[PDB]
Ligand binder design. Structure first.
Ligand code: CDL
Ligand code: PC1
Ligand code: PC1
Ligand code: PTY
Ligand code: HEM
Ligand code: HEM
Ligand code: LMT
Ligand code: LMT
Lengths: 61, 273, 438, 55, 124, 402, 124
């Protein structure tokens, strides 16, 4: 309300184990999973899409 | 360096654009030019043949290839316009250079009206040349074989690219290896990217450099000779001549310009002491 | 080769430590105490600093006025300071005025009146101090830095304490504080300059013999801090200079990485546009900052406490549109302690530190401060030969390994004061703690 | 100065997609602009590909 | 290439009697055919300036030298756009073709190169 | 400090038991000798620039490898260049000073880009304190030229490269140079200075253009950045009793959170103001000053009246207690000045460059109450009081009001 | 619409007894349902400011009013992005909803409109 050295209450949000490697590793697991599915999704997308340029069924026939 | 380097990519896109557009007529030169140029990709090791079949959409140049070249020929000019815009935005940080090679920050003129009205002169000169070809000689720059419909059975007497690709074709012929030749031909364009490094001059441009001007003159005439050799038959004595011209082309970038520009630096310093 | 630090104890457990210099004619004697604001709770926060005021307000013998006169007659001065973990009371005098000064210090520590009238008078003086620190920007920045880094923990509290406590501190709680904390096993009597050790031990036996001992004597410099990555922004558009501190959790006095953290700190180093030599310093950050006019100054720090520390940098800048560059380039220099430093930077920083640790001690007060600090944090004075060996033991592998676990991809505590509109949000600052290219 | 600010080409991208200062309280209806950019990219990619097969 | 390089190589040549005997006459002819003096330039006016080092050297020119350089650049630009050459006193005579800029750029580069060396020092 | 001579240069050194040595070159080149205003400040800032053997860049990079530090300052009497290093690195530092005195390339770009901007920041930092300004203003009124020249370079009167080069031609000469080594083996220093400073010009003693003249007056520096007031009294015959009187009158507190028991300290009660009496001996004239700073011009004015009263009261009668307190505070001030490297160097520098033997702190004279009161009486009855007001000058006192 | 217009029309209504009897209660409910007070805003904080006239009026605010407005905008923005409403002392009470800006904008607009009129004067 007046003193700026009294930090507002962050206890509803603060994690107790915030400085641990386990704590960071979890968030990077989420980021990594996301990057992994994006890589697998991009690869699938590009492969299926670009295959339109390979000889079509009537040409192969 | 940045507008120049983007400029080199513009030049590559123009070549691709023009090559695909020429195939669209589907005359004899269209088909056979597509066949021989697209088969250069077969030289890429391991996957080359697969890439060619993928480009063609089949086992030879045919309908799939023509329909994809139409779609890409329509697109590529838009890509080219974007890169043209990019090289101008990159240039805008330094402004245009000028024929003396010095700063113009001391003495500037507005683009309009001065260069607007000076541009109109060359626009009308260009339109006069355009008119003479389009109305009075519309087929002077073309190949009569492109008025014969594509026939995969009959091979034309001589399969050459359009004239503006001829120097690069002469460079490719000079190297006996297929992959070697493809690399040399691509290198002949990408080597433009090293001019910022191999020019060791402390002065910008050739206006005041008599030896550099002579070397530049030889380089340009050699480039025109390579063009001519691109459309002769593979016969003596043009085979060896094409190889010597190819060596000269590359040695300009790798040897002569670095040497000459080094010596001229010394002559300017000593000569003006 | 400096003279040996002599050390003796009394029966109560008071340490006496001295370093004589027969070339000077003044002497600094004083009492270093292993106690400070961090020993208060939330209710009596401010007490230690309150006492420091009252210590000079009169004793059972000498009144306030008599005290003033006695020191004036000595010829030198008395000085005191309270920090988070340490309190100091010292007297600089002439060679032969040392017994007077020891007697006055012993008096103000043991036998201070703490008269309700004086408590009530200082209660206003200290209240005015709350509204005038506001000007000392470096202190404002570092107090917010501790408050946020050690959020809701004792190290996070200020030394002055809240306004509320200042109005409610009683002589009872003052007396309780100094009875619990100012014990003989926590105190060191230090003499530097023209002092005889044997004379000082006698004076200690005369004046500090009736000091209480604590019930459970732990060794000197005995302490759990949980650092919070966080930010305080105190934007003030009317200030011309931005003051920014960035810190990570650093090392305690007795860490195995204490010297490695000092070497890493010296690789970044300090810079000040007002000093002539600063444009020519070898530090990469120095070169970036000076060439591009990014800052008026920066000062790397590695602050230690008994059980934690803060390692970071303090920046000042008027370049308000390029604060982003300043922060970006600083944190990319920290990244290089993890990715790129080699024997080149490490051996250069070691060379500079081997001298720096000795150069700092250039007067009797600095020597006394060094003996007192080391005795109250480590329990012993570390000889320059031991210090030279611990520095020599720091390799480039040690620096890289330390930076990879302390700096790389770690949370920071960040404080910005002044025109800091250009300082980006927490995420963009914290994203510069790593390099995607590595 | 950071390259993304110093180089004129990078700086144009930077100004639109990276350092661009946004209100801190845009709600999800401010997301349709990027969806429309996505639709335009999909229509360009699928449309140019259809043009390779369409007569 | 750096001005430092050019100056050092030139000094090697000027030292060698044989080398100077063959290079100095060539260099003088080269300068005559170059023809920059016919636009009223001095040799140093032609050196590329869009570099940090050169911008710093130009800022260190004495004000007089700096104002005269600006005039020669403007005058040469006006000859260039008109497709004329200098006549009379506008032509740079060989005795006026002084290396007014070379000392400044050599000092700028000296520090720049020392800084590069010292950035790579290894305590022995 | 064993005074000797090495190749025409006066060298004083005192060995000690520390790993840290301080080597100082003291030059007779302070502002009282300044040819043009501000030149001595500029010359000080031009030390350790590019020399012919070693660039400023190379010097700083090598200094960092030795972990040495560099300190320079200008007074009214001297330029002092001090280095602090480890004992063993002495030869390097001697050679560095030799390069600066013999071979400094005074280049125009260094002046414009390096030296002058640093000199300007130096001054602005000093002037942030209005008391600094007031005491500087007071010397300018009291002496006009010589001691009245500004110590620092100011923007209104620019120093040129030719000005600095000429002054350096005078100052950097064996006749104007003293070497002072703290914690340096005296025999080793003499050997090194004897080889390094052998080819330095002999030159001639730099002199003050004109005799020192004393004047009274007022200076009214209108600033917006704080308030101060100096009351100075120019002294025609500098005497050591004024040290005792300055310490007696006092002003600063000897104790935290206190006012102090000194007359001038007691003049500030009820005000957020500070005071300090100082005495400046310059050999041939002196200045006794009392400076008061504060935020309130009304409070400064209030203290100023009490301050002049204090001086008059002292001229009446001093007690024996007070005289002993003056001896004690003065011996202490002397001792700490001989310890502080900055002031130490100048003290021995004065002994070597002039011939004024240093008064050891242990030999500081005890002045009787008679002698102190007599000294204060002469000051209260001065024909030439100087008053320099800084800040809201319309609200600060004038000489005739005091 | 100009603030001048809005203020004048409002004053016509407040004058008419009948009109005020029916409009004032409606206006009070409208303000309650508007709900800007639940984000800690005062009515005038909502007025469009990206115009020359409004920029001038905001520059004429006393510094304290200006600093308080900045805080209410930042605070309301933080409620908006968090999808929360003000509670307690952050809610603007009806007695705190003062027209701090209206007098400044009315003076800016008065001059702007007089200037437009006087630009069209015809000497008679
Ligand atoms: C097409 C391609 C698919 C991509 C999806 C994009 C759609 C996202 C979007 O813009 O809408 C989400 C959007 C959530 O956005 P938000 O950022 O949480 O809040 C925006 C409003 O401020 C939210 O307004 P509010 O804070 O006043 O909350 C109101 C909302 C509750 O909002 C929610 O959080 C849901 O509930 C309703 O309005 C429901 C209406 C009552 C029906 C009975 O949902 C709505 O706002 C729906 C209300 C529209 C009517
Ligand atoms: C569409 C294709 C998406 C490709 C993503 C494939 C893998 C990259 C990835 O997940 O990015 C993680 C990485 C890292 O994410 P980060 O930036 O959060 O991690 C940095 C911190 N460390 C290294 C300590 C984990 O992001 C990038 O490198 C950017 C590339 C993304 C595109
Ligand atoms: C064919 C060989 C051409 C050599 C040109 C030598 C210079 C010359 O005389 O040109 C006149 C002019 C000389 O102009 P200048 O700018 O050097 O000199 C103007 C006059 N002075 C020196 C007095 C200021 O050169 C040009 O304008 C050259 C432009 C070159 C364009 C070449 C196109 C070839 C395309 C192949 C691309 C691969
Ligand atoms: C579609 C696929 C989604 C994008 C895949 C990207 C990889 C995702 C994981 C990588 C990742 O999180 O790392 C960040 C990369 O994100 C980025 O750099 C990109 C962030 C999100 C990309 C999407 C942008 C808007 C999407 C809307 C479409 C736009 C319309 C145009 C069609 C680094 O970034 P950090 O700063 O968090 O790093 C923190 C410290 N290194
Ligand atoms: C579609 C093709 C191109 C267009 C429309 C185009 C247009 C322009 C224009 C309008 C300018 C400024 C005016 C001028 O100097 O003529 C220019 C400058 C420039 N262009 Fe291009 N350009 C194209 C292709 C290229 C190519 C292929 C290169 C390089 C290989 C290139 C390199 C440059 C450079 C270096 C400049 C700066 C020249 C200077 O002013 O000194 N451009 N271009
Ligand atoms: C804003 C971008 C575009 C929109 C909204 C759009 C819309 C449409 C629509 C509505 C159709 C009818 C689809 C059907 O029912 O079969 C269509 C067909 C087509 N579009 Fe596009 N289009 C876009 C971009 C493009 C582009 C860039 C191309 C490039 C050529 C293209 C090529 C085609 C082709 C070849 C067809 C006919 C084959 C088919 O029906 O699928 N379109 N487009
Ligand atoms: C820079 C990117 C690198 C180059 C990109 C490569 C372009 C083309 C690569 C492969 C495309 C065709 O590769 C082929 O793809 C299709 C899916 O698309 C796969 O086919 C598989 O899935 C499809 C449907 O998803 C089924 O009809 C099929 O029966 C099954 O085998 C083949 O198993 C794979 O051999
Ligand atoms: C959306 C896809 C990403 C590609 C970028 C879109 C292309 C459009 C860019 C060209 C239009 C010019 O865009 C213009 O660039 C300059 C700098 O780049 C911006 O300028 C802005 O940023 C720079 C620094 O980041 C500051 O110097 C400047 O004060 C600020 O206004 C303009 O606000 C923007 O309007």
């Amino acid at each position: 309300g007046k003193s700026t050295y009294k930090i507002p209450d962050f206890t509803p949000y603060l994690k107790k184990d915030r400085n641990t490697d386990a704590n960071r590793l979890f968030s990077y697991f989420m980021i990594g999973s996301f990057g992994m599915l994006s890589a697998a999704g991009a690869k699938a997308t590009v492969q299926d899409f670009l295959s339109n340029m390979s000889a079509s069924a009537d040409v192969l026939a | 360096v940045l507008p120049w380097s983007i400029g080199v990519i513009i030049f590559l896109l123009l070549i691709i654009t023009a090559f695909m557009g020429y195939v669209l007529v589907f005359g004899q030169m269209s088909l056979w030019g597509a066949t021989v140029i697209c088969n250069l990709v077969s030289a890429i090791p391991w996957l080359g043949e697969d890439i060619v079949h993928f480009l063609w959409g089949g086992f030879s140049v045919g309908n799939p290839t023509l329909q994809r070249f139409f779609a890409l020929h329509y697109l590529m000019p838009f890509v080219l316009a974007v890169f043209a815009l990019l090289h101008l935005i990159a240039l805008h940080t330094a402004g245009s250079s000028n024929p003396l090679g010095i700063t113009s920050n001391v003495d500037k003129l507005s683009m309009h009206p001065y260069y607007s009205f000076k541009d109109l002169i060359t626009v009308f000169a260009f339109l006069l040349m355009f008119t003479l070809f389009v109305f009075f000689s519309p087929d002077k720059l073309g190949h009569p074989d492109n008025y014969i419909p594509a026939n995969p059975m009959v091979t034309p007497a001589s399969i050459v690219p359009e004239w503006y690709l001829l120097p690069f074709y002469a460079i490719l012929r000079a190297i006996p290896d297929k992959l070697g030749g493809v690399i040399a031909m691509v290198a002949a364009i990408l080597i433009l990217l090293i001019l910022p490094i191999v020019d060791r001059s402390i002065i910008r441009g050739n206006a005041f450099k008599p030896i550099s001007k002579l070397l530049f003159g030889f380089f340009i005439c050699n480039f025109l000779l390579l063009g001519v050799l691109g459309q002769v038959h593979i016969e003596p004595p043009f085979i060896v001549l094409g190889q010597i011209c190819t060596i000269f082309y590359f040695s300009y970038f790798l040897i002569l310009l670095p040497m000459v520009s080094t010596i001229e630096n010394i002559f300017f310093y000593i000569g003006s002491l | 080769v400096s003279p040996k630090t002599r050390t003796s104890n009394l029966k109560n457990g008071l340490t006496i430590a001295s370093e004589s210099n027969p070339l000077v004619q003044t002497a600094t004697v004083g009492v270093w105490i292993d106690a400070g604001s961090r020993n208060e709770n939330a209710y009596n926060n401010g007490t230690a600093h309150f006492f420091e005021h009252l210590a000079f307000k009169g004793t059972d013998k000498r009144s306030q006025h008599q005290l003033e006169l006695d020191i004036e007659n000595m010829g030198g001065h008395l000085n005191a300071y309270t920090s988070r973990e340490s309190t100091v009371y010292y007297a600089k005098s002439f060679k032969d005025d040392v017994p007077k000064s020891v007697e006055i210090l012993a008096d103000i520590l043991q036998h201070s009146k703490l008269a309700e009238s004086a408590i009530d008078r200082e209660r206003e003086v200290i209240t005015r101090e709350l509204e005038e620190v506001n000007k000392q920007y470096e202190e404002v920045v570092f107090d917010h830095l501790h408050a946020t880094a050690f959020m809701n923990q004792p190290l996070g509290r200020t030394i002055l304490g809240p306004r509320e406590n200042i109005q409610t501190i009683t002589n009872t709680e003052l007396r309780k504080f100094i009875t619990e904390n100012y014990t003989a096993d926590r105190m060191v009597l230090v003499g530097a300059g023209a002092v005889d050790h044997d004379a000082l031990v006698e004076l200690a036996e005369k004046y500090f013999s009736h000091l209480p001992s604590s019930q459970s004597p732990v060794p000197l410099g005995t302490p759990i801090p949980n650092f919070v990555g966080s930010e305080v922004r105190l934007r003030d558009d009317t200030m011309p200079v931005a003051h920014i501190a960035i810190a990570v959790e650093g090392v305690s006095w007795t860490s195995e990485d204490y010297y490695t953290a000092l070497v890493a700190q010296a690789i970044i180093g300090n810079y000040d546009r007002a000093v002539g030599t600063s444009r020519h310093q070898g530090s990469r950050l120095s070169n970036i900052v000076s060439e591009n006019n990014l800052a008026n100054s920066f000062q790397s720090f590695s602050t230690s406490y008994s059980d934690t520390g803060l390692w970071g940098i303090y920046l000042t800048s008027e370049n308000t549109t390029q604060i982003d560059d300043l922060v970006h380039f600083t944190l990319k220099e920290w990244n290089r302690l993890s990715t790129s430093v080699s024997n080149l930077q490490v051996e250069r920083a070691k060379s500079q530190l081997k001298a720096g640790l000795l150069l700092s001690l250039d007067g009797t007060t600095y020597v006394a401060e060094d003996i007192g600090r080391q005795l109250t944090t480590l329990g012993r004075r570390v000889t320059p030969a031991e210090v030279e060996a611990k520095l020599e033991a720091v390799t480039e592998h040690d620096v890289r390994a330390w930076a990879q676990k302390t700096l790389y991809d770690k949370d920071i505590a960040l404080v910005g004061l002044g025109p800091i509109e250009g300082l980006y949000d927490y995420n963009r600052i914290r994203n510069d703690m790593s390099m995607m290219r590595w | 100065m950071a390259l993304r600010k110093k180089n004129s080409l990078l700086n144009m991208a930077n100004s639109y997609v990276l350092d661009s200062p946004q209100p801190s309280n845009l709600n999800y209806f401010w997301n349709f602009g990027s969806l429309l950019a996505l639709c335009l990219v999909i229509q360009l990619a699928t449309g140019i590909t259809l043009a390779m097969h369409y007569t | 290439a750096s001005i430092t390089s050019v100056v050092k190589t030139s000094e090697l040549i000027l030292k060698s009697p044989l080398l100077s005997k063959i290079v100095v006459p060539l260099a003088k002819t080269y300068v005559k055919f170059s023809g920059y003096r016919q636009l009223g330039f001095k040799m140093n006016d032609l050196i590329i300036e869009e570099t940090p080092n050169m911008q710093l050297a130009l800022r260190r020119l004495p004000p007089t030298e700096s104002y005269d350089r600006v005039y020669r650049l403007i005058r040469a630009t006006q000859f260039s756009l008109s497709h004329k050459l200098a006549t009379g006193n506008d032509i740079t005579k060989p005795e006026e073709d002084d290396h007014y800029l070379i000392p400044y750029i050599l000092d700028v580069e000296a520090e720049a190169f020392e800084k590069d060396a010292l950035d790579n020092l290894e305590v022995v | 400090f064993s005074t000797a001579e090495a190749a025409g240069v006066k060298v004083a050194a005192q060995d000690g038991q520390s790993p840290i040595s301080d080597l100082s070159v003291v030059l007779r080149g302070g502002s009282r000798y300044a040819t043009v205003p501000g030149v001595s400040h500029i010359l000080e800032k031009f030390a350790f620039q590019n020399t012919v053997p070693k660039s400023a860049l190379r010097f700083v990079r090598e200094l960092e490898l030795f972990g040495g530090k560099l300190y320079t300052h200008t007074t009214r009497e001297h330029i002092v260049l001090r280095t602090q290093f480890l004992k063993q690195d002495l030869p390097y530092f001697v050679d560095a000073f030799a390069n600066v005195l013999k071979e400094t390339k005074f280049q125009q770009f260094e002046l414009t880009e390096r030296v002058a901007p640093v000199a300007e920041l130096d001054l602005l930092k000093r002037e942030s304190d209005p008391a600094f300004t007031a005491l500087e203003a007071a010397h300018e009124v009291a002496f006009r030229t010589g001691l009245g020249n500004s110590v620092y370079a100011q923007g209104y009167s620019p120093v040129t490269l030719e000005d600095v080069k000429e002054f350096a031609r005078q100052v950097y000469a064996k006749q104007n140079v003293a070497v002072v080594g703290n914690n340096v083996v005296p025999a080793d220093l003499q050997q090194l200075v004897g080889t390094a400073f052998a080819d330095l010009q002999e030159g001639s003693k730099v002199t003050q253009a004109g005799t020192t003249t004393l004047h009274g007056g007022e200076a009214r520096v209108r600033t917006s950045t704080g308030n101060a007031l100096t009351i100075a009294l120019p002294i025609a015959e500098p005497k050591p009793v004024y040290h005792a009187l300055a310490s007696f009158l006092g002003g600063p507190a000897s104790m935290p959170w206190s006012v102090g028991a000194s007359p001038l300290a007691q003049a500030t009660v009820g005000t957020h103001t500070s005071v300090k009496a100082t005495y400046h001996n310059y050999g041939d004239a002196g200045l006794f000053a009392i400076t008061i700073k504060g935020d309130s011009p009304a409070e400064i004015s209030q203290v100023a009246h009490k301050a002049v009263q204090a001086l008059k009261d002292t001229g009446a009668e001093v007690t024996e207690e007070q005289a002993a307190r003056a001896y004690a505070k003065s011996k202490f001030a002397a001792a700490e000045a001989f310890e502080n490297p900055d002031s130490s160097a100048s003290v021995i520098g004065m002994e070597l460059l002039s011939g004024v033997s240093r008064i050891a702190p242990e030999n500081v004279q005890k002045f009787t109450p008679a002698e102190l009161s007599e000294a204060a009486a002469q000051l209260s009855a001065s024909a030439k009081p100087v008053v320099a007001a800084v800040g809201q000058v319309h609200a600060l006192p004038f000489a005739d009001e005091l």
